[PDB]
Design a protein around this nucleic acid. Structure first.
Ligand SMILES: [Mg+2]
Ligand SMILES: [Mg+2]
Ligand SMILES: [Mg+2]
Ligand SMILES: [Mg+2]
Ligand SMILES: [Mg+2]
Ligand SMILES: [Mg+2]
Ligand SMILES: [Mg+2]
Ligand SMILES: [Mg+2]
Ligand SMILES: [Mg+2]
Ligand SMILES: [Mg+2]
Ligand SMILES: [Mg+2]
Ligand SMILES: [Mg+2]
Ligand SMILES: [Mg+2]
Ligand SMILES: [Mg+2]
Lengths: 63, 261, 178, 145
RNA sequence: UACCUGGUUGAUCCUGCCAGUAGUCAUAUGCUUGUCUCAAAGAUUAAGCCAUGCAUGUGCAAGUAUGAACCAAUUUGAACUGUGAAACUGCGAAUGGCUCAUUAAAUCAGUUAUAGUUUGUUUGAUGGUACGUGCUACUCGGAUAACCGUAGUAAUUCUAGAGCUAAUACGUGCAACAAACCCCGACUUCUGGGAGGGGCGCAUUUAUUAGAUAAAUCCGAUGAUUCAUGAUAACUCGACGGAUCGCACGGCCUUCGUGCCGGCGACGCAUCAUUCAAAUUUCUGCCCUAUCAACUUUCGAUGGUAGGAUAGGGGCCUACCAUGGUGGUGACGGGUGACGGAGAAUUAGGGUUCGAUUCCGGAGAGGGAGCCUGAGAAACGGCUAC
RNA sequence: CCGGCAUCGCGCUCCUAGCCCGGCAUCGUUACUUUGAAGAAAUUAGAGUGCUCAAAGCAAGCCAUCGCUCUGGAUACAUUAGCAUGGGAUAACAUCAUAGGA
RNA sequence: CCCGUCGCUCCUACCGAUUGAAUGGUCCGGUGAAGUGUUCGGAUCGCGGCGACGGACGUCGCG
């Protein structure tokens, strides 16, 4: 059964610590200021950013 | 399995066919012929895929049953026929002629040639030895067996073979100082010049080659195919004259070509 | 049936070997032919791998035998088997296999050696310059037969072919027949 | 002679002993001469094989076996069989988690042509041939005591 | 994100676990569920059992059509024309699909080998002699389906008997030289000669022989061969060496006679090479267990010789002989709710756990076992037996 | 960073062999390290590309978006074992007192 | 603060006379279906010689 070979992936990840006030308020600041619908929109931006930062850090490690 | 396998699943097809992984469950499965089916390019891909002369499986069959396509001088109506390196594909109805040659990335390309340079091919000799009644004959690496060769042609050499008369017309003696185009491994496609050959008793012989733009590399004997005598090659080269380049070189090529457009 | 796989064998360590497979046809053997030496010749064909044929000879009477030093090969009859180095009971059963020792009528050889006007004698005399014919062969001739060794596989090619013993080999088998 | 110790007369294939017009310089295995061959891969045919009287179908230099494949080197471990030895290969196997090594070994049966003499614990060089018995697929080519 | 927090005390600092906190291409279950794209889905327990339907058949100009037809329709020689159903012949059904039971140096992966073999088919090359006392080819068989018709049995692509008729079915059977070389050998002259005239394609099997140095007219290959290959003597109750089929016409007379020819194709026989592969095979690598330390060996366990068998190597098997072979570097045994790998989840790094499942390899078709057909099966949408 | 020599650099007939001249092969083995070859795809990483975004996919983009042009379909990782190449510090194993040495 | 015996309620495992029971495999001994190879056999079926005999017949030609 072809079409089983189509890839797919995860775009965000939940926070390790569920209820911390500092992160909760910092995240709500952004969810309000930029008019986002829920935390998932913020977390996928964070996840994409972490990807590009890991790439950058790896390249910076080399010579 | 209790016998020969007749299907080739698409993920198992050769990588240089560039078949897309969702375009079906099966791949053409080249029939037996003069090339080893992992280094060939069947007619289905030549017509449907590259030349876009047909859109489907059955259209290729409709083309072939009409005796248009000609491979190396004969009309081949088999649809999974294993055309290979240095073959000629000719469509007289359109009067168009192609030599199958590698590109630097290791993939077959149909290099257009003229009608003068389509009556001949080059072929590398597998071996020479005697046959029934002491007659000498030579083996090529694409099935052809020629009897009564020139008594100088030894194994691993190259021969020019006219398709009209079907006999030899010239040959190149495999040795240091000749141009060679690599047909296997990561270096396939790269042309070069034999600079060194080191023997190893009981293993494969290795060849050391130097490109015209200076880059030096190496392969093993079975993957080297001489093209010409001296530095000049006897046959046409494709879009890049068999010169490999780094990824940064082609990045520069794209951005530099992005300022004139 | 009879099989040629290694599965039933014990490992070199002596550990027993579990069955992970059934018996495959490309692994088969057949029962032997034990070609008897008898008058009523019978050679029966076998269909084997690749569509090919082997000729299982069940009963043979004549053979082709070469006399090496004289460079002549002639058809003759087999009179008996006298020694087999593998098993004596093969001799008792008059069974033909490769490397068995047989006695041979030898008359076609004798009549060849009877050969070898003016130009004919100027050739008999060209020969007889190198006539040696060591006495061991001569005595057998006067007896009427020659000791011979089979050099073909009767159950494989359906024939009994061989050579006559000479020199070291001849004398060795002679002292063993004592 | 010394060789003929078995229930059948043992001889080299394709050498005609009772030849008529013999010679001492035709070629190995022509005109009655004993047959010998050079194995290749830089090994030298022992003199004791050249002018030998033994008959060994499995010998690399006078028998019918060809040497091709791998060339292992080891130390002799057992010489209590007829014309066959067990050799030990000692080697280091890497243990990846601990980044360290451990000593491992393998026992290889190899056929020993009568042209050599081996004690226990001599350096041996063996080369691969076709299966000669249930466990033997190698032939001794060099012995350094 | 290379992270911790609650809980032993009157209070303290620790050890240390318990609980929390996050993920899962991880299964189930609960409550809920509006749109778009995406796509796993009777693996786990029972490789337990199966009603019913379907999953493998097939026709080109080019094997065989008066057996009965459709469609032309004959001017009633000549065609069953043009198109065919059925049926013989051929081919295929050994691929694919499903599953993961058995299986722990086994499979399997990377890496080797065949100078140890088979290979329908594709592709390239190649092919004399069949008897004629080798003096340029030497004749045509019967019998069976579709049909037609008499039946049995409750029954089945269960079956008997009779009348017809084909071949690319089946069975016979013409053969291309100098014979090139080899052995005989009446006579000639004396032989180093000439020699009249009888026996020698391609396979099979055996034997003998050739297949060349080294610096002061040797000449194919490999790292390596008694190699490729050639000569010679014989052998075989020889698988073989075209009694086949399509259109196209189109030069020219020797009886001007389908006249002498001559083409482009289809199918088929044999050999080599190639391709499509397989089978064996080398080295290294696998989880837990010592409350599993000896195991194998009469009866093959390790090796040797000669055979038999196989496509081929090999204790694969037989006869005879020797006493070996593995083991604390873990043999042998046991567990696995264990097919191996590519890979999966989590991952600072190092690691831990998983891998029935779509790709590769293996294995099986209720359990064992044996086979026929065939290039290929120990086949199960084949057979035989339990 | 390195080649090429020279100090008080055990040799060459044979392969490469400068215009008498560098840079020659067997008469101790390995581990280690360097470079290369040969390593299936899919997966992973990653280059390119506006499926409207994304998860994806391997496409597509320009022409006068007119009798077609330019094309792409990279690259990398791949422990251990096996093959080859340079190095010879570190560490193994073998070993000049019978001179049986060159 | 705290230990143990004895008594009560629940749970878990252990030993155990009983040749306890069930179950699968393995080894040795025996019986052995069916196929494959072989030795005979020979229903009938083919030049149906022939004597040149009158569709038969048997001596048959070997398959
Ligand atoms: Mg399958
Ligand atoms: Mg195909
Ligand atoms: Mg951590
Ligand atoms: Mg306390
Ligand atoms: Mg408290
Ligand atoms: Mg916890
Ligand atoms: Mg043996
Ligand atoms: Mg043997
Ligand atoms: Mg299992
Ligand atoms: Mg399971
Ligand atoms: Mg599979
Ligand atoms: Mg099966
Ligand atoms: Mg079932
Ligand atoms: Mg079955």
């Amino acid at each position: 059964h072809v079409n089983f070979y189509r890839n797919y992936g995860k775009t965000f990840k939940k926070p390790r610590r569920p209820y911390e006030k500092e992160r909760l308020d910092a995240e709500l600041k952004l969810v309000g200021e930029y008019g986002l619908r829920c935390k998932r929109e913020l977390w996928r931006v964070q996840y994409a950013l972490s990807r590009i930062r890991n790439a950058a850090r790896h390249l910076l490690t080399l010579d | 399995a209790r016998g020969l396998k007749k299907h080739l699943k698409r993920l198992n097809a050769p990588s240089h066919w560039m078949l897309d992984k969702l375009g079906g469950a099966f791949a053409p499965k080249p029939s037996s012929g003069p090339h080893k089916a992992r280094e060939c390019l069947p007619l289905i891909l030549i017509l449907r895929n590259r030349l876009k002369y047909a859109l489907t499986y059955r259209e290729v069959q409709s083309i072939l049953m009409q005796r248009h396509i000609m491979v190396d001088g004969k009309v081949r109506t088999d649809k999974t026929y294993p055309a290979g390196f240095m073959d000629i594909i000719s469509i007289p109805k359109t009067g168009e002629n192609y030599r199958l040659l590698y590109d630097t990335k290791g993939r077959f390309r149909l290099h257009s040639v003229r009608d003068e340079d389509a009556k001949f091919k080059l072929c590398k000799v597998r071996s020479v030895q005697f046959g029934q009644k002491g007659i000498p004959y030579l083996n090529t690496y694409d099935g052809r067996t020629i009897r009564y060769p020139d008594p100088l042609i030894k194994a691993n050499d190259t021969i020019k073979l006219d398709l009209e008369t079907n006999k030899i017309v010239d040959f190149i003696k495999f040795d240091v100082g000749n141009v060679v185009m690599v047909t296997g491994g990561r270096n396939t496609g790269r042309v070069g010049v034999i600079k060194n050959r080191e023997k190893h008793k009981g293993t494969f012989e290795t060849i050391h080659v130097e490109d015209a733009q200076g880059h030096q590399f190496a392969t093993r004997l079975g993957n080297v195919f001489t093209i010409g005598k001296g530095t000049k090659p006897w046959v046409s080269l494709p879009k890049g004259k068999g010169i490999k380049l780094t990824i940064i070189e082609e990045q520069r090529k794209r951005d530099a070509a992005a300022q004139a457009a | 049936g009879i099989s040629r796989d290694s599965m039933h064998k014990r490992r070199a360590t002596g550990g027993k070997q579990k069955a992970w497979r059934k018996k495959r046809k490309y692994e088969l053997g057949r029962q032997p032919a034990n070609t008897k030496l008898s008058s009523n010749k019978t050679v029966r064909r076998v269909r084997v791998r690749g569509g090919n044929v082997k000729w299982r000879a069940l009963r043979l009477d004549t053979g082709n035998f070469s006399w090496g030093s004289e460079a002549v090969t002639r058809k003759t009859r087999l009179l008996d088997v006298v020694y087999n180095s593998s098993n004596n009971e093969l001799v008792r059963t008059q069974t033909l296999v490769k490397n068995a020792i047989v006695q041979v009528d030898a008359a076609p050889f004798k009549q060849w050696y009877l050969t070898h006007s003016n130009n004919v004698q100027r050739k008999l005399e060209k020969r007889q310059q190198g006539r040696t014919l060591d006495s061991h062969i001569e005595e057998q001739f006067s007896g009427g037969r020659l000791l011979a060794c089979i050099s073909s596989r009767p159950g494989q090619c359906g024939r009994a072919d061989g050579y006559i013993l000479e020199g070291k080999e001849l004398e060795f088998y002679m002292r063993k027949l004592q | 002679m010394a060789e003929q110790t078995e229930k059948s007369f043992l001889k080299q294939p394709k050498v005609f002993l009772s030849t008529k017009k013999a010679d001492k310089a035709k070629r190995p295995g022509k005109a009655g001469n004993r047959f010998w061959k050079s194995v290749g891969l830089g090994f030298k045919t022992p003199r004791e094989a050249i002018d030998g009287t033994y008959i060994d179908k499995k010998c690399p230099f006078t028998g019918t076996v060809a040497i091709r494949g791998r060339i292992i080197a080891g130390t002799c471990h057992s010489a209590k069989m007829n014309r066959t030895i067990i050799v030990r290969r000692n080697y280091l196997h890497f243990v990846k988690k601990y980044q360290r090594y451990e000593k491992r070994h393998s026992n290889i049966p190899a056929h020993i042509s009568p042209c050599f003499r081996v004690k226990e614990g001599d350096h041996v060089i063996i080369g691969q041939c076709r299966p000669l018995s249930k466990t033997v697929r190698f032939n001794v080519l060099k012995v350094v005591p």
